[PDB]
Structure 1
Amino acid sequence: MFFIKDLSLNITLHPSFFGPRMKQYLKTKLLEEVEGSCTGKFGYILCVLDYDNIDIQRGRILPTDGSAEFNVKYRAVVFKPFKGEVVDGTVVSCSQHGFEVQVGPMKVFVTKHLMPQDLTFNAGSNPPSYQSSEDVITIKSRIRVKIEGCISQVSSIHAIGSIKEDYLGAI
């Protein structure tokens, strides 16, 4: 899953920053605008790699105000989830509708009726849990989830998964 994609970005530098430590200010701007960002297109952009050799190229000067626009060619580590992708993470929240597992920078949600049947919801617990003949899932338990579907949204991706198939559930 986790990928390393070759991306690029455009930055418009005011003329004031047309100093000597310019390359530095761009490389900075890049990281400010990219690391932490999210798109359904490339998923979560987590970390820009090889800081040292970020290609700045020659920026062209806009022609009415005097800013320049550089096309910063970088490379980075991204995280885009998928439907049918098996992933395991830790629990975070848990109600009567299901519980939310956290895989990486993202959060997956397991709906009650997407769990096995013999697995019940013990409300009269704390932290709230889900009990089975054998299992006891809750707040911090690690779980192996199958991502059933994703929903790209704003600055993040969210999905819903099940643990009703085989070899899925707590670990």
Structure 2
Amino acid sequence: MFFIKDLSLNITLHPSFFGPRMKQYLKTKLLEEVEGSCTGKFGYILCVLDYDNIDIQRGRILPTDGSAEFNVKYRAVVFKPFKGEVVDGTVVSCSQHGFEVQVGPMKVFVTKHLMPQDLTFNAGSNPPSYQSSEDVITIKSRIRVKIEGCISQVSSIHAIGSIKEDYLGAI
């Protein structure tokens, strides 16, 4: 799910950027260090809103490092997964263990135990696919996956989904 969240970060600037245009460097650092990053607390931080109105607080020089630490307050859009959520995605890859969909910046793993009984793995077909009487699941296919569990690390998030429930699976 996508949210607009208020976030704060501590950015450290090397003294080489302690010039008249240091504010621009901090803004550049925020894009290069926040956008495209993953955090288990706020999820995947995608885009920074109001890039021109980022609040930069006074910088504190670290005693030994000599670099200035800046507290930066910004507004950004974050994709945070949840257990029990229903999402749609594309099957990036398939294997014996299962097939995983590509939902936004995240990948949801669908285990065989989380799949319906009828579906069976078939490695003879190129590319490998799960075939059943009603539908066939292959790379690039569209699947409606329900997240059955999420593990969030400080800089990584992994989720597992199921398609056993009704109105799930191939779209």
Fold in common (TM above 0.5)? yes
Q: Residues 86 and 145 of structure 2 are in contact (CA less than 8 Å); yes or no, is this contact kept in structure 1? A: yes
Residues 129 and 20 of structure 1: CA distance in aligned 2, closer, same or farther (over 3 Å)? same
TM-score, with normalisation over the residues of structure 2? 0.92
Indicate if the aligned counterparts of 2:41 and 2:154 stay in contact, CA closer than 8 A.
no
Instruction: Among all aligned residue pairs of Structure 1 and Structure 2, give the percentage whose two residues are the same amino acid.
Output: 100
1:159 aligns with 2:159: yes
Distance across 1 between alignment mates of 2:57 and 2:110: 46
Could you give the per-residue CA deviations for residues 121-159 of structure 1, whole angstroms, max 9, x where no partner exists?
222111111111110110110000000001224643111
SS at match of 2:25: helix
Give secondary structure in 2 for the equivalent of 1:73.
strand
Q: In the alignment, is the contact (CA less than 8 A) between 2:130 and 2:138 conserved in 1?
A: yes
Distance 1:65-1:82 versus aligned 2 partners, 3 A rule: closer
Asked if the contact 1:10–1:71 (Cα under 8 Å) also holds between the matched residues in 2, the reply is: yes
RMSD in angstroms over aligned alpha carbons? 1.7
1:60/1:100 Cα in 2 relative to 1: closer, same or farther (>3 Å)? Answer: same
Instruction: For 1:58 and 1:152, locate their aligned partners in 2 and report how far apart those are by CA, in whole Å.
Output: 32
Helix, strand or coil at the partner of 2:4: strand
Q: Which moved more, 1:62-71 or 1:18-27?
A: 62-71
Size of the alignment, in residue pairs? 171
> After alignment, is 142-151 or 57-66 more displaced?
57-66
Bigger mean CA offset, 98-107 vs 4-13: 4-13
SS at match of 2:91: strand
Query: How far apart in 2 are the matches of 1:55 and 1:88?
Result: 36
CA distance in 2, matches of 1:125, 1:145: 23
1:128–1:14 Cα change, 3 Å = closer
Are 1:106 and 1:156, in contact at CA under 8 Å, matched by a contact in 2?
no
Structure 2 gap segments, 5+ residues each = none
Distance 2:11 2:39 in 1: 18
Q: How far 1:168 moved relative to its partner?
A: 0.3
Unaligned segments of structure 1, at least 5 residues: none
Contact 1:84-1:149 within 8 A present in 2 as well: yes
| Secondary structure of 1:30's aligned partner | helix
Q: Higher strand fraction: Structure 1 or Structure 2?
A: 2
TM-score (norm 1): 0.92
TM-superposed deviation, 1:65: 6.2
For residues 75-104 of structure 1, give each alpha carbon's deviation from its aligned partner in whole angstroms, at most 9, with x where no partner exists: 111111011010110001111221111111
Name the SS of the counterpart of 2:148 in structure 1. strand
* Range that drifts further, 112-121 or 97-106: 112-121
- Structure 1 CA distance, aligned partners of 2:97 and 2:149? 17
State the Cα distance separating 1:37 from its structure 2 match: 1.6
